[PDB]
Design a protein around this ligand. Structure first.
Ligand SMILES: [Mg+2]
Ligand SMILES: [Mg+2]
Ligand SMILES: [Mg+2]
Length: 293
DNA sequence: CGTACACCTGATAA
DNA sequence: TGGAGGATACC
DNA sequence: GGTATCCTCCATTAT
DNA sequence: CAGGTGTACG
């Protein structure tokens, strides 16, 4: 685990969270907590174990869903000690940065015990209102006065290190093998390779910037909602640009075996064997093997 | 014959 | 992704 | 008591 | 994230 890879991976998968929960034991009647969270499927538990170890063995890993597990640090103290100084040095670049910085300001308030205070509380409520999904219904009603503190906007963010991209692709990227019915290929099917990164449209600009960074690909919009795709279909670019990149800058987690299989599919395609029935079945078999893992 | 971008849609693993 | 609620610990 | 963290579970949507 | 498909074009 490289630092930029981690930042990429968290740009893709992580969360920065604030809870303001109701409880009348607290002098304010409200308990304030901050949480840094990253959740993955079971097949990537070893990667959560790396992260913990990466962050000084801190925090806790727990069954989250039916086949996911979560890594969480919810101590304000140790968040201030370890997390904030990591992301302040190796900064996020998706819109998730806006949530990191707002989360940061809360911790800062918590750090001086202000959260235990009425003004403190409203500042944290004001800050929580611009983070992730905003105020809850309960908090809108308990704090009908508060004005969300403006979402910070940090313009034009560039990929700070090729490992960031390794990281993020390991999270929100994908190595696709498609077998497409073809009336004109003689073996019956086209063997397509697609590299693809998915992200919400709010990060259009970052998505656009990937075309210069990798010197290939194009961007599409999901017609069904605000979601973009950075896609590479062109096999020459996959051989020439994508495969060599991730060979130097390695994927993390399970997804790394899936890249290796896809690389292998590409060898078969390189020697033109995909147009042979034998090679088509090598590809069915590798494709079969992918995501297992 | 073969490939590649534009378009399409279902399943979760975030 | 991002959130909730109950239990427990800690000073 | 007041506060801070641990633990178990979940609805929706960005993957 | 992850499978497709339609079809223009060399
Ligand atoms: Mg993501
Ligand atoms: Mg993701
Ligand atoms: Mg992932």
């Amino acid at each position: 685990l490289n630092p930029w890879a981690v930042v990429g991976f968290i740009d893709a998968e992580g969360s920065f969270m604030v809870r303001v929960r109701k409880n009348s034991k607290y002098k304010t009647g409200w308990l304030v907590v901050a949480i840094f969270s990253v959740t993955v499927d079971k097949k990537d538990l070893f990667l959560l174990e790396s992260l913990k170890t990466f962050f000084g063995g801190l925090g806790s890993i727990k069954k989250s869903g039916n086949s996911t597990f979560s890594y969480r640090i919810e101590s304000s103290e140790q968040l201030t000690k370890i997390i904030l100084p990591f992301f302040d040095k190796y900064s996020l670049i998706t819109e998730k940065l806006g949530d990191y910085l707002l989360f940061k300001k809360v911790l800062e308030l918590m750090g001086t015990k202000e959260h235990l205070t009425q003004r403190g509380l409203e500042k944290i409520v004001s800050l929580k209102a611009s983070i992730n999904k905003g105020l809850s219904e309960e908090l809108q009603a308990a704090f009908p006065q508060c004005v969300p503190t403006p979402r910070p906007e940090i313009n034009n963010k560039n990929i700070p290190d090729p490992f960031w991209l390794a990281g993020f692709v390991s999270g929100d990227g994908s190595f696709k093998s498609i077998l497409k019915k073809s009336e004109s290929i003689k073996v019956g099917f086209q063997s397509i390779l697609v590299f693809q990164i998915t992200q919400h449209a709010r990060d259009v600009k970052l998505m656009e910037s990937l075309i210069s960074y990798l010197g290939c690909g194009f961007i599409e919009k999901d017609s069904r909602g605000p979601w973009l795709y950075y896609t590479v279909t062109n096999f020459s670019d996959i051989q020439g640009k994508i495969i060599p990149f991730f060979h130097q800058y390695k994927i993390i987690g399970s997804a790394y075996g899936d890249y290796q299989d896809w690389c292998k599919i590409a060898l078969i395609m390189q020697n033109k064997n995909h147009l042979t029935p034998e090679g088509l079945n090598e590809i069915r078999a590798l494709k079969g093997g992918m995501n297992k893992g």
